[PDB]
Amino acid sequence: ATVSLWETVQKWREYRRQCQRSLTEDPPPATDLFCNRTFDEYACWPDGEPGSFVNVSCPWYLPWASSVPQGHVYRFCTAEGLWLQKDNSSLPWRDLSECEESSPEEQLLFLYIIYTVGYALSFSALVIASAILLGFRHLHCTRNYIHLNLFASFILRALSVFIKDAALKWMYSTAAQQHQWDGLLSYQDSLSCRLVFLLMQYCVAANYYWLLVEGVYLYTLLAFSVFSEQWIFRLYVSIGWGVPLLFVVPWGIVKYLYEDEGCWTRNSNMNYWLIIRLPILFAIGVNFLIFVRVICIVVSKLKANLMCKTDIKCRLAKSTLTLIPLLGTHEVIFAFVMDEHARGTLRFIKLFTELSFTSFQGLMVAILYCFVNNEVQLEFRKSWERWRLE
Ligand SMILES: N#Cc1ccc(COc2cccc(C3CCN(Cc4nc5ccc(C(=O)O)cc5n4C[C@@H]4CCO4)CC3)n2)c(F)c1
């Protein structure tokens, strides 16, 4: 199994709660002059009779606490009833030598750097592409409207991941000592974390639905449904931007009401998470069906003409490589390779690898459908010919 600082802090939470409960639930000694019990971010020492040490077993939240489960952290208090002071008047003396001791933290830090650079290339490419597709009035179709909505979806997704990773600065605090673990959990179980992480869940689902809209619109062009345009366009924008709210807010309400701690991370024994991951899988499967049907149409269309041995293969390969970015069909590979029962560091390493590869779908789309496009080059040439005369 894989453990990291995440699991250590999660165990520390339970240890602190348990020791804090036993701190008051423990009956006080009848005699006096005793040394006062406490919990000082490392272990919960009990009352100690004066003139001798206190022998607490090694805390069990430590990653190495199982190798030697008989070491004792040693502390001494004076026979007058005072914890022994260390030199230079610091925290009371305690002996720690008994129990004491690439990695997933560095791994996660590198996957994070590649993913931020990619989502930051995709953001730049798509903002320039949206500007170009909005500037010229000759590029106003309905398919271009769908493209602009898709680009807006990608930009919103890439802006949400930056807000999650710079709200909580986990990329500096991955080497935190004991005295900072309260400030991590305190921020975790707050409301700002919950809302910043629920916004990300909606911006991730809108992005899959605006790729189901692309697929369905292409299919309805090729399956000859020429229904009333205004009804069709309003229906498409609706299914794009407002269907997520049909499975996000039920999840966002059950998690709010029924959970006491945490920042809406996957629950241990329950399975509340299916309200978000079930429709995403549904949309991925449907878009895969649309992809295979459209390829089945294109292959016959180019088989109908007169072509050599290698030109059909070249054209089919080029068409497929052009269509995988728009319909997001690489997700079906990613959905199979992801374990949906892993929690913690295992889950955070599987998810970040997908996000490193699927972070530059937005640059790929913006370069395939706004820069190597024929008509955009044509419009640039037309505008430069006129500006030549002044
Ligand atoms: N308590 C606590 C604590 C413990 C350790 C550290 C620092 O060390 C370590 C070690 C391993 C991994 C990590 C980071 C790994 C990930 N991020 C934040 C984060 N991105 C997420 C994306 C998707 C999901 C998901 O479920 O889909 C959930 C996501 N989560 C976890 C929670 C959920 C909102 O944020 C949290 C930390 N950090 C600390 F900063 C805080």
Three-state DSSP class for residue 78: strand
| Ligand 1 centroid, distance to 9 Cα (angstroms) | 11
Query: Dihedral, CA atoms, 299, 305, 306, 309, nearest 10 degrees?
Result: 0
Using left for φ > 0, alpha for ψ between -120 and 50, and beta otherwise, residue 350 falls in alpha
CA gap 347, 2 in Å, rounded: 10
Say if residues 290 and 262 touch (Cβ distance below 8 Å).
no
Bridge partners (DSSP) of residue 45 are 38
340-377 in b/e form (b: 16+ CB < 10 A) is: eeeebbbbbbeebbbbbebbbbbbbbbbbbbeebeebe
- Lookup: tokens for 341: 């029962």
Record the resolution, in angstroms: 3.2
| Method by which this entry was solved | cryo-EM
Ligand 1 atom index nearest CA of 164:
20
Identify whether the C-beta of residue 239 lies closer than 8 Å to the C-beta of residue 209: yes
**Ligand 1 centroid – CA 254 distance (Å):** 21
Looking at residue 80, the DSSP 8-state letter turns out to be T
Q: How far is the CA of 318 from the centre of ligand 1 (A)?
A: 40
First-to-last CA distance in the chain?
A: 70
Output the CA 92–ligand 1 centroid distance in Å: 34
What are the start-end ranges of the H helices in the chain? 5-25, 104-135, 143-167, 181-188, 192-222, 229-241, 248-258, 274-303, 309-327, 331-336, 345-357, 361-368, 374-387
Domain-wise residue ranges, the chain: 105-389
Q: Which residues line ligand 1 (CB under 6 A)?
A: 4-6, 9, 105, 108, 164, 168, 170, 173-174, 184-185, 188, 193, 197, 263, 265-266, 345, 348, 351
